[PDB]
Amino acid sequence: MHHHHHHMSTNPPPPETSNPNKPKRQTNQLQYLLRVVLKTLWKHQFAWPFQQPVDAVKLNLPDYYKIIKTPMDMGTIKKRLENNYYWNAQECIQDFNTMFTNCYIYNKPGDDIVLMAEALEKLFLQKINELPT
Ligand SMILES: COc1ccccc1/C=C/C(=O)c1ccc(O)cc1O
Numbered sequence: 001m002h003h004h005h006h007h008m009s010t011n012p013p014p015p016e017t018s019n020p021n022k023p024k025r026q027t028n029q030l031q032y033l034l035r036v037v038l039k040t041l042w043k044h045q046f047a048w049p050f051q052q053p054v055d056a057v058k059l060n061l062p063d064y065y066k067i068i069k070t071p072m073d074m075g076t077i078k079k080r081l082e083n084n085y086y087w088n089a090q091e092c093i094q095d096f097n098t099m100f101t102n103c104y105i106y107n108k109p110g111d112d113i114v115l116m117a118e119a120l121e122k123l124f125l126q127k128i129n130e131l132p133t
């Protein structure tokens, strides 16, 4: 009897940051999303949980990827922007919204992590209120 001692929690593969077959563009709005929006959010005191895929193994959150089926994080977004992965600003904004929404789904109002996401989302909405063009 192994008692399933060898079945251990693992993280899923991270989201793709490059797809040569995906249509992509460099737009002023996407350049701004990288240079202004992401890079100021990245420097925020609360950015650190969001700077890379949730590592459910390290955090001992074995239920995270049971609950969250569309993970997203700013590290993935930053790579996508740097790799010219996106067709338009709205695709990138959708990834930000997914990142915040996942946090609110998995956690509860008043949790430290949710207060962090709320603060970043406030700054995010302030920054994207006006894009180029
Ligand atoms: C319940 O999750 C938290 C609660 C309070 C503060 C932070 C978190 C989440 C931390 C992360 O998600 C995280 C931090 C560092 C890292 O390398 C990977 C992560 O998923």
Ligand code: NA
Pocket: 103, 104, 105, 106, 107, 108, 109
């Ligand atoms: Na929730």
Ligand code: NA
Pocket: 126, 127, 128, 129, 130, 131
């Ligand atoms: Na702006």
